[PDB]
Amino acid sequence: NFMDIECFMVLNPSQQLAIAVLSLTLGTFTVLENLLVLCVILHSRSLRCRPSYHFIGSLAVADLLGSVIFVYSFIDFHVFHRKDSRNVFLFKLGGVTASFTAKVGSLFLAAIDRYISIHRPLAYKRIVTRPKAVVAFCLMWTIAIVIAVLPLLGWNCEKLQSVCSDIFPHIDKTYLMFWIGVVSVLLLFIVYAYMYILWKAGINESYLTGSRDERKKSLLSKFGMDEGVTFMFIGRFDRGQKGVDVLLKAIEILSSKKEFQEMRFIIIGKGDPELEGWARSLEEKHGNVKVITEMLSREFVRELYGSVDFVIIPSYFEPFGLVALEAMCLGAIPIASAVGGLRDIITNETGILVKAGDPGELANAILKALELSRSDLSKFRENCKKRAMSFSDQARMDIELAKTLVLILVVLIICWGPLLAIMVYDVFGKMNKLIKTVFAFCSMLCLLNSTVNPIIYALRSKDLRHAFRSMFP
Ligand SMILES: CCc1c(C(=O)NCCc2ccc(N3CCCCC3)cc2)[nH]c2ccc(Cl)cc12
Ligand SMILES: CCCCCCC(C)(C)c1ccc([C@@H]2C[C@H](O)CC[C@H]2CCCO)c(O)c1
């Protein structure tokens, strides 16, 4: 309590109405459509209860209540020259800082959703549910409320006798660095988060030409073995989760059988030196097993999925169907255990289900594979080709949404970036008359942001538009 509050009302009476009709219209064009964006969401049973678009409510609410507060209390201050209480101002201001912090945490939670929906394609539907998404936003909001009510708890320059900010009344210049700090680094990770998801997302069986018998007759000739039935395993060597130890226990016990001559096995991986010393012995002990644990070209392995006819995923549990999807897309019947996602991607009409970590029943399911016709075999390769299109499909609709989230994050950094940076110089230096009044006119960006956020839903979201013509035809 050294300087009074009126030294902050800088707008002369000609530029207090010009800033008013801006707040009242640009603040009406955001309340109208955000209150409308909330109407499409909660009617459409699709967008309402969905963890993918759940943020569009958490984004159109912080841009509505956080906007009506900033239109009332700002016009009631720079134009109506009102001096509230010392905790009534921080209450009215706390409702604004919480909202912006909340929409940052919305672009943060929506990034966890994006990473899971793309790089955990079938774990996603079972990790990110409606319960786990409702709890994550409510506690993301719980945090956004706390950071906003700190100066109401005693992190202010009045109740602490500290240098006040030249821009915000009743607020320390350290609470700024705690609020600009936690937000600039959050956007930094968030900006870095969506760029990792997009970069590693650009990382078709119509590229492989000819019949499969030809491409498999050319493959086994490279190894020097006869046209045989080619089983394939890909993945790290371990005994903990991948079933390479299970698979080697089956190839050995199948060797004591009459049906082993026709069976051709090919394994690639890298891991336990004793698991490698076990598999490489079979490669020279048998004339029909070849193990490749060195220099595997990523498009050569692409030729394997399309040349072979069976895929072996004997893992104890698949966290994400990385081979399961690429193999089936290239029409190679996968023989995996019904653990993890491999239950609803590999079924009794798409592949062969085995018991996890069971070496005997794995072999008994390799002999079953040897005794079936092309009628069945060509039909499984189709159902593997048909299941994959339902993935590179949704995983395409997912990738389009991680572009939408960046477009929202982009126009968030553009609107709130300059304001945030003008706050930064308040911490270090002082703010003269000019730099303090340009901030009040640049302050309108948090309303323009809430004006272009509902516009870009109606441009990117393919579902939200069709939901709009459904109740307003
Ligand atoms: C239902 C989630 C949701 C919101 C939303 O307001 N969550 C805020 C929930 C919440 C929880 C706790 C508090 N506390 C106040 C301070 C003291 C500690 C507890 C406050 C608020 N907004 C949404 C928009 C769309 C969708 Cl789909 C869901 C939501
Ligand atoms: C660490 C606090 C962050 C504040 C958010 C910045 C924001 C752009 C929302 C903002 C907030 C407040 C004002 C006005 C500053 C004037 O000095 C006093 C009146 C404020 C509006 C009343 C808020 O209840 C602002 O221009 C920008």
UniProtKB/Swiss-Prot annotation:
Residue span relative to the full protein: 101 to 413 of 472
Organ and tissue specificity: Widely expressed, with highest levels in fetal and adult brain. Expression levels of isoform 2 and isoform 3 are much lower than those of isoform 1.
Function: G-protein coupled receptor for endogenous cannabinoids (eCBs), including N-arachidonoylethanolamide (also called anandamide or AEA) and 2-arachidonoylglycerol (2-AG), as well as phytocannabinoids, such as delta(9)-tetrahydrocannabinol (THC). Mediates many cannabinoid-induced effects, acting, among others, on food intake, memory loss, gastrointestinal motility, catalepsy, ambulatory activity, anxiety, chronic pain. Signaling typically involves reduction in cyclic AMP.
Extracellular side: 76-87, 156-173, 426-437
Gene Ontology MF annotations: cannabinoid receptor activity; G protein-coupled receptor activity; identical protein binding
GO cellular component: actin cytoskeleton; cytoplasm; GABA-ergic synapse; glutamatergic synapse; growth cone; membrane raft; mitochondrial outer membrane; plasma membrane
Means of activity regulation: Hemopressin, a peptide derived from hemoglobin subunit alpha (HBA1 and/or HBA2), acts as an antagonist peptide: hemopressin-binding efficiently blocks cannabinoid receptor CNR1 and subsequent signaling.
Family: Belongs to the G-protein coupled receptor 1 family.
UniProt keywords, alphabetically: Cell membrane, Cell projection, G-protein coupled receptor, Glycoprotein, Lipoprotein, Membrane, Mitochondrion, Mitochondrion outer membrane, Neurodegeneration, Obesity, Palmitate, Phosphoprotein, Receptor, Synapse, Transducer, Transmembrane, Transmembrane helix
Protein name: Cannabinoid receptor 1
Illness association: Obesity: A condition characterized by an increase of body weight beyond the limitation of skeletal and physical requirements, as the result of excessive accumulation of body fat.
Induction (UniProt): Up-regulated by endocannabinoid anandamide.
One biological process term in Gene Ontology: adenylate cyclase-activating G protein-coupled receptor signaling pathway
Keyword Nuclease recorded: no
Membrane topology, from the record: Multi-pass membrane protein
Assembly description: Interacts (via C-terminus) with CNRIP1; this interaction attenuates constitutive, but not agonist-dependent, inhibition of voltage-gated Ca(2+) channels in neurons. Associates with G protein alpha subunits, including G(i) alpha-1/GNAI1, G(i) alpha-3/GNAI3 and G(o)-alpha/GNAO1; palmitoylation is important for interaction with GNAI3 and GNAO1.
